[PDB]
Design a protein around this nucleic acid. Structure first.
Lengths: 103, 49, 141, 97, 50, 85, 99, 376, 124, 81, 243
RNA sequence: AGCUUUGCGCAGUGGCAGUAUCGUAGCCAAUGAGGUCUAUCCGAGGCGCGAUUAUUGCUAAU
């Protein structure tokens, strides 16, 4: 989960900081103690679903990037939208909630 | 005299000739608000025409 | 507020009134922590450099200097007093009180207006000057 | 400062004309090239404000009157019962109620 | 707390960006409108006869 | 050999010389070694400068202003003659 | 380089020469800075096929309208030599419309 | 046809240059190394002098299908790519990905709008064995130009050490290849070196300032782009000046270790961080004190003219008088309370109309009139 | 003296005449100061002769000027100090190259021709 | 190397003649504005307090406004509570 | 005042007690400069500033900017709803709203520059073909350029100059720019031919223009932008509009 | 012997503008200042600061 929406001292705003994140290769082994690192032989995760938000908190429209397993077609769904996007539009947009898989 | 929406006294106006070549004057009078700071209460018309 | 020079005891403020002859001494009596006093102690900040030629500003905490409360009626939260050549320059506002500005204002031009008017009327040798603006209302509407 | 690269400037002297002409850009999209060519009439004999040469031309389309202020757009239709029902059904097909 | 004692001495004194002709303008003279307006206003208010 | 300073410093040096002369003259006059400069007057300035005093004796006043003109012109002409090769 | 030096020397000798000025911009001058050479040649008022050289420069710059205008000027009495007429015929036959 | 046969000798020369450059990758692992650069520069000049004529032929042959596209796409290679992609039928412009890689979206939409209103007619099959052949050889010549571009960029660490460090070898190659060689640009003023490869980009209904006008490869160099957009032009002039200063050195092969190049780079960086230096401390002068009773003033022709300009003109003074007990029709509908008083009033005043004065005529400033003189 | 790569380098006798001609062309608006403007005049073919200075430490920044003159058959000559040349040209800043252009019916034609003749017999 | 000064007609070193012309024509009235404003600021008296005075006033203000400073909140004018 | 006082109190508190405490005014000026730069939407990056001081000043600027935005919007709500507010309050609120709106405009223009046109080529072609079909159906001949010899050439110039002078027809006192404007109109009236030649040259070969100033007139419901254009270019624009 | 060109000086006569003149032991600058048209072209000063009754003096009244 990504903390975009936060309240200031006066009014709630959003943090529109884009993130450059891979989708099929990431290593997380540095974040575990070695006395536990030996248990896990799989610390690599692949993105599955992505949540992107639009505009202000009071006027938002969620969009979803889903990965069809087996294939690699990343599809964009807002209400009924269907569009096989490329693995770069996932990076360009600002993510809000990401789903992974340790494989 | 002093009757008709384009007042009859306009026909005798001195610059009647040059006002014949003044077209779209009402539109630019309406858009005068974006060029001059103080709003014109008589934006809808123009005393000359 | 904190930037302007401060006076700590009774002798210092009297000296500051006496140690000048060619300007006006504008003293902000009150408490610099007051919301009212801090509203105008930043206006007095924003114009301290501008009026250097004909005005000097000192701040006084009445608790620190409890010597002029009774004589000059220091019981409103904020007070402004103008002095010229060791003479309190009365100023006629729209308000009933004509010896002080007991309210904190907001515009940096009007205070310079009042200070320059006081200086102009004090060079002539008056004791009561007349402000340009009328403060019998707030012009709000 | 900022370099205006997407918005017309309304403070420009000729801006009115542009807006007017650019209004002529959009209102036909509302009217269509056909109905626009019936209110304006033939170029040989253009009509005046809110007038049609024949009654059939008024009776030939929903949009019977149209007037465009600088920003405001004012349309006056006239739907028979059948076409009104057709339009309502078309709307409800894309918008369940 | 972890700023060196010399770094506080190395703070730069910020200055104004605008030039003299915009910080401290020479007083702008305020002249009257040319009197040709007074004549033109009344000239526009005279009509022909035919 | 020498160098030829440009027109900018030509104008600057001429201005220095003239301002120097003017200030020296003004200081001398403030001392009083010469009388304060009488206002240079012409025909067009005749009634602007001396008109009130020129009404009583107009011909004397015009004679005096023409004498001043002649003195200026003579100073110029004999300055040229002294500078003549 | 020898040709460039010879052309420069020829230009230095009686620069008003129409033929040398006309054949300088088109031959020795590169397509870059040819326009400056064209203006320098046009500084000479006489146009004995110098206008034809300007037309050739415009045609090289692929300006159809400018080339046609210059050829019409060149085909006039100013450059009444048959070379201008032949160039005009070739350009009209080589024009995009050829009408 | 004639152009394709002409490039045959150039194609053979380019193949020889390719063999030399491939050997240069092996010989650098009696025909010296510098000559392999000089002849390659001559060959790239020749391939450009053939690219221009083949582009002219393409424009002439394709003007029958679409006569307006050349006026919308100025760049040559862009024109060849666009005519190669669009084809005879122009319905391949909507959501076309390869158009985007060549043309700006604004110029994509302008050429699409023009494609909607085209008076050109379809081309025969004979036109499609000429235009596509020319486009293919144009892309081949561009590939050869880049394949010698990389080699020249690699070798300017040796051929022009001073120029290759101020701007970088890449832009150095781009400005030396197009200039006709180091000797050619050594005879070239810095003002002209600024405009090396300055595309005459067609303004797409924008201000000419928006689409950089008079901008050359030196303006697109990495050194200048590091600066804020306002200082770039001022930086472009200086960097091109020091570029030609280093170029004249490199032409005669002095300071091959780059001492003059490093000195010029130091001067450029000093000027740059002097321009980017923050403004100094500026004192806020106080407002002047209120004035005293009286002060002596001068008076003469200047004071007379001041009194004439600010004096009460008779038409002005007649307007101040506002009669008494005489209702008048409210003139100037748009703003009432503007009555001329006795000016033009039957109440009182002169029988003749108050003649207009001339001293109060509006006048423009001296510097503004100077701007008028220069603008015309 | 200071720079061996000084082929037409003139001595302190005709340098005075050269600077006098430069000043007179300045009064007549008949020169282009600066190496770039001298090069532009040489390219345009209207340059009659250009004078540079042997004090520019990287002389090869201005050593293309004699080659360009050789190409265009234009007289060229050096001096002994850039500051003197700059000040004589009518500007305070040190100038390392100036050019003298053409004028129709110029009053300086005789002197410029004399200067061209004097330089052309000094090359060897 | 010796040159001749255009203004004084005296032998001068050739190396200095540039700044010699820059400085020998130094405008005489410039000296007062160089030596007048500096005297004004030397005799000028400060308007704002010395930095230590700002520090002390800030401490005194923090003593009272516990709605901002401190950790033990109290009244606006009260020292501590 | 409280936020700035707290920031200065902390900074001077952790600042060493040496003679360096003479730099309190420097810190206040740095705070004011950063606040101005955020208000002016201008990059602010002090080179020699320490990163903790810079971090604290950024946090101060962010907090004061959040309060500034909220207060400006709240005061605007008060004014539009009809509440009783002061004149200086209206002036300051209008200034704040001008700054906010121009920041948003900078955002929108920068977004357009990087995102390219928001109109697709398909819809652009549809609109353009609709327009050309309409114009061809109306048999409309294109408007010709104003020729060198035009019968009504001065009449349009006269009307444009009169219109430009209507803004000053009711006036008692004039600023410098106003005086120069009136001078320009009256000079163009004195020499119509040269002025019209200048206008034609501007229409034919001028594409780079000087910056046009902006301000806002507040109707207390919305803000109407007021654009000030270069005085010489106003004449050309007016003549073009009339033609 | 005159005639005549140009720059710089000294004065004289006259016209014109006071929103402009002036300073630069501040900085940069023909090794390029500065660039809107026309840019393989243009090409001399610019910036910052200070003085100011928008150059500065006397005499003259009040």
């Amino acid at each position: 989960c990504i903390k975009r929406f936060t309240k200031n001292n006066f009014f709630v705003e959003k943090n529109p900081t884009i993130v450059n994140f891979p989708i099929t290769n990431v290593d997380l082994r540095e974040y575990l103690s070695e006395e536990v690192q030996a248990v896990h032989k799989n610390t690599t995760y692949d993105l599955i679903a992505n949540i992107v938000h639009d505009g202000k908190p009071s006027e938002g429209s969620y969009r979803i990037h889903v990965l069809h397993h087996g294939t690699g077609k990343w599809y964009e769904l807002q209400d009924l939208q269907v569009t096989d996007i490329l693995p770069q539009m996932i990076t360009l947009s600002e993510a809000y909630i990401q789903i992974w898989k340790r494989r | 005299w002093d009757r008709g929406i384009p007042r009859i006294n306009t026909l005798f106006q001195k610059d009647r000739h040059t006002l014949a070549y003044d077209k779209g004057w009402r539109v630019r009078t309406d858009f005068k608000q974006y060029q001059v700071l103080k709003q014109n209460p008589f934006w809808w018309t123009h005393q000359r025409h | 507020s904190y930037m302007l020079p401060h006076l700590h005891n009774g002798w210092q403020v009297d000296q500051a009134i006496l140690s000048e002859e060619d300007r006006v001494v504008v003293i902000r009596f009150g408490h610099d922590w007051d919301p009212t006093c801090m509203k105008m102690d930043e206006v007095l900040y924003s114009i301290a450099e501008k009026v250097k030629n004909f005005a000097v500003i000192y701040l006084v905490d009445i608790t620190e200097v409890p010597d002029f409360n009774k004589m000059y009626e220091l019981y409103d939260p904020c007070t402004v007093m103008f002095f010229f050549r060791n003479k309190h320059i009365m100023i006629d506002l729209g308000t009933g009180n004509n010896n002080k500005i007991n309210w904190a204002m907001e515009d940096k031009q009007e205070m310079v207006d009042i200070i320059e008017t006081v200086y102009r009327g004090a060079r002539k040798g008056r004791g009561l000057v007349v402000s340009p603006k009328d403060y019998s209302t707030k012009y709000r509407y | 400062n900022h370099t205006n690269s997407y918005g017309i400037i309304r403070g420009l002297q000729f801006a009115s004309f542009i807006v007017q002409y650019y209004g002529l850009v959009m209102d036909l999209l509302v009217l269509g090239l056909h109905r626009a060519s019936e209110m304006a009439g033939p170029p040989q004999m253009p009509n005046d404000f809110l007038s049609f040469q024949d009654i059939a031309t008024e009776a030939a389309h929903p949009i019977r009157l149209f007037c465009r202020y600088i920003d405001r757009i004012h349309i006056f239709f006239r739907f028979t019962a059948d076409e009104a029902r057709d339009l309502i059904q078309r709307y409800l097909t894309e918008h369940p109620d | 707390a972890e700023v060196t004692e010399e770094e506080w001495l190395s703070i730069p004194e910020v200055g104004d960006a605008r030039n003299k002709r915009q910080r401290n303008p020479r007083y702008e003279k305020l002249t009257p409108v040319p009197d040709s307006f007074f004549a033109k206003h009344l000239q526009t208010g005279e009509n022909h006869t035919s | 050999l020498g160098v030829y300073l440009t027109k900018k410093e030509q104008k600057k040096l001429r201005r220095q010389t003239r301002r120097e002369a003017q200030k020296e003259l003004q200081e001398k006059v403030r001392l009083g070694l010469m009388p304060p400069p009488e206002p240079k007057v012409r025909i067009s300035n005749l009634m602007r400068v001396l008109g009130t005093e020129a009404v009583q004796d107009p011909t004397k006043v015009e004679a005096h202003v023409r004498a001043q003109m002649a003195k200026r012109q003579k100073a110029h002409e004999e300055a040229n003659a002294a500078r003549k090769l | 380089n020898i040709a460039n030096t010879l052309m420069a020397k020829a230009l230095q000798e009686c620069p008003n020469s129409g033929i040398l000025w006309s054949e300088a911009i088109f031959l020795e001058a590169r397509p870059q800075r040819r326009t400056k050479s064209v203006d320098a040649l046009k500084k000479c008022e006489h146009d004995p096929h110098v206008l034809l050289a300007v037309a050739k420069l415009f045609w090289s710059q692929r300006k159809i309208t400018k080339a046609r205008e210059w050829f019409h000027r060149t085909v006039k009495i100013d450059s009444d030599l048959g070379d201008a007429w032949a160039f005009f015929y070739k350009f009209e036959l080589q024009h995009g419309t050829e009408e | 046809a004639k152009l394709w046969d002409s490039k045959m000798f150039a194609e053979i020369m380019m193949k020889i240059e390719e063999y030399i450059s491939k050997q240069a990758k092996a010989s650098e692992v009696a025909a010296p190394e510098y000559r392999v650069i000089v002849d390659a520069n001559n060959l790239t000049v020749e391939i450009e002098n053939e690219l221009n004529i083949i582009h002219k032929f393409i424009r002439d042959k394709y003007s029958k299908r679409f006569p307006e596209l050349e006026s919308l796409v100025p760049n040559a290679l862009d024109y060849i790519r666009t005519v190669k992609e669009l084809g005879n039928s122009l319905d391949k412009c909507k959501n076309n990905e390869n158009l985007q890689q060549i043309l700006t979206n604004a110029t994509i939409m302008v050429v699409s709008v023009t494609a909607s209103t085209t008076q050109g007619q379809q081309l025969s099959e004979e036109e499609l064995e000429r235009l596509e052949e020319a486009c293919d050889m144009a892309l081949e010549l561009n590939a050869s130009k880049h394949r010698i571009y990389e080699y020249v960029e690699s070798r300017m660490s040796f051929i022009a050490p001073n120029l290759s460090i101020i701007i970088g070898a890449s832009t150095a190659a781009k400005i030396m290849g197009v200039a006709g060689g180091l000797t050619n640009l050594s005879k070239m003023p810095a003002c002209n070196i600024m405009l090396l490869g300055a595309q005459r980009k067609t303004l797409s209904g924008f201000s000419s300032t928006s689409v950089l006008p008079h901008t050359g490869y030196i303006y697109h160099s990495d050194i200048v782009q590091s600066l804020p957009p306002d200082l770039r032009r001022k930086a472009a002039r200086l960097v091109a000046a020091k570029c030609t200063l280093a170029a004249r050195v490199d032409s005669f092969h002095e300071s091959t270790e780059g001492k003059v190049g490093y000195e010029l780079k130091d001067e450029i960086e000093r000027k740059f961080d002097k321009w980017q230096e923050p403004p100094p401390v500026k004192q806020v002068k106080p407002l002047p004190a209120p004035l005293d009773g009286q002060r002596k003033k001068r008076g003469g022709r200047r004071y007379r003219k001041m009194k004439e300009r600010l004096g009460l003109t008779e038409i002005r003074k007649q307007a101040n008088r506002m009669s008494f007990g005489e209702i008048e029709e409210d003139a100037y509908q748009e703003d009432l309370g503007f009555s001329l008083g006795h000016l033009g009033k039957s109440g009182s005043g002169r029988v003749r109309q108050t003649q207009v004065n001339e001293a109060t005529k509006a006048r423009i400033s001296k510097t503004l009139q100077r701007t008028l003189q220069k603008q015309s | 003296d200071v720079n061996p790569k000084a082929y037409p380098l003139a001595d302190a006798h005709l340098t005075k005449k050269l600077l006098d001609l430069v000043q007179q062309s300045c009064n007549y608006k008949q020169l282009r100061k600066g190496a770039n403007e001298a090069t532009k005049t040489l390219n345009r073919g209207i340059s009659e002769f250009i004078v540079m200075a042997a004090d520019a430490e990287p002389l090869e920044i201005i050593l293309h000027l004699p080659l360009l003159c050789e190409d265009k058959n234009v007289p060229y000559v050096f001096v002994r100090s850039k500051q003197a040349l700059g000040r004589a040209c009518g500007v305070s800043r040190p100038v390392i190259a100036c050019s003298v252009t053409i004028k129709e019916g110029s009053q300086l034609k005789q002197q410029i021709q004399s200067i061209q003749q004097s330089i052309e017999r000094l090359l060897v | 190397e010796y040159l001749v000064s255009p203004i004084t007609g005296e032998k001068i070193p050739a190396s200095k003649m540039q700044e010699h012309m820059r400085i020998g024509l130094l405008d005489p009235r410039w000296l007062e504005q160089r030596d007048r404003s500096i005297r004004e600021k030397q005799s000028d008296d400060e308007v704002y307090a010395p930095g230590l005075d700002i520090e002390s006033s800030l401490k005194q203000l923090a003593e009272r406004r516990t709605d901002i400073f401190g950790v033990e909140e109290t009244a606006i004018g009260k020292k501590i509570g | 005042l409280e936020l700035r006082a707290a920031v200065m109190h902390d900074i001077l508190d952790m600042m060493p007690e040496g003679i360096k405490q003479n730099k309190a005014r420097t810190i206040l000026q740095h705070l004011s400069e950063a606040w101005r730069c955020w208000k002016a939407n201008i990059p602010w990056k002090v080179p020699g500033l320490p990163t903790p001081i810079e971090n604290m000043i950024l946090r101060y600027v962010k907090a004061k900017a959040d309060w500034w935005t909220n207060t400006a919007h709240y005061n605007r709500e008060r004014i539009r709803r009809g509440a009783t507010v002061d004149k200086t309050v209206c002036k300051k609120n209008l200034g704040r709203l001008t700054r906010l709106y121009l920041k948003a405009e900078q955002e929108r223009q920068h977004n357009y520059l990087k995102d390219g046109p928001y109109i697709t080529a398909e819809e652009a072609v549809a609109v353009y073909t609709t327009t050309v079909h309409w114009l061809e159906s109306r048999r409309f001949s294109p408007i010709p350029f104003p020729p060198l010899s035009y019968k009504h050439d001065t009449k349009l110039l006269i009307l444009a100059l009169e219109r430009l002078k209507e803004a000053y027809s009711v006036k008692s006192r004039l600023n410098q720019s106003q005086r120069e404007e009136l001078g320009l109109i009256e000079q163009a009236y004195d020499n119509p031919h040269e002025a019209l030649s200048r206008i034609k040259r501007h229409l034919l070969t001028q594409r780079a223009f000087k910056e046009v100033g902006i301000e806002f007139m507040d109707l207390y419901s919305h803000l109407v932008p007021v654009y000030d254009v270069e005085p010489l270019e106003k004449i050309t624009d007016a003549y073009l509009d009339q033609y």
